[PDB]
Amino acid sequence: FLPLVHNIIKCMDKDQDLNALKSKFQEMRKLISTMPGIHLSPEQQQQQLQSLREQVRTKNELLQKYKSLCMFE
């Protein structure tokens, strides 16, 4: 957003709407970049990363508990 303000001040010194238009372009690209973010909190993301890792690990754990035991005599 800083080069937009620099373009504004250089344009007004040498002699705006287009700079505001690309500022709105930055706003809509930030809106695209909203669905990655605080939808689920980043701290909560840190906690549920361990939840997903524990899910993977307990799924694997039940898999080798099913496979490992010799149910045959």
């Binding site: 957003f1 800083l2 937009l4 303000v5 504004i8 001040i9 007004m12 500022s23 930055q26 706003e27 690209r29 930030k30 970049s33 909203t34 669905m35 990655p36 973010g37 605080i38 939808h39 980043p42 993301q45 997903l52 899910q55 993977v56 799924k59 039940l62 898999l63």
Partner: protein, 74 residues
């Protein structure tokens, strides 16, 4: 960065609005130091937005992994 981008958007926009007339009435730096303060601020945000983007899309893969795993369990 959701409420953060809009806060960075509205602060930088009205401060850029502020700098228009103070240049016009001359023909200060206290309002200028907040500009660069929010400039290096908000440069963290789209980097953190893509940090959220890479993290969000990484989780898309991981839940696609465990969906097959659970289906393989299923």
């Amino acid at each position: 960065t959701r409420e953060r981008l809009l806060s960075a958007l509205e602060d930088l926009e009205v401060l850029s609005r502020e700098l228009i007339e103070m240049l016009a009435i001359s023909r200060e730096n206290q309002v200028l130091e907040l500009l660069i303060h929010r400039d290096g601020e908000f440069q963290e945000l789209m980097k953190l937005a893509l940090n959220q983007g890479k993290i969000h899309h990484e989780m898309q893969v991981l839940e696609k992994e465990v969906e097959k795993r659970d289906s393989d369990i299923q």
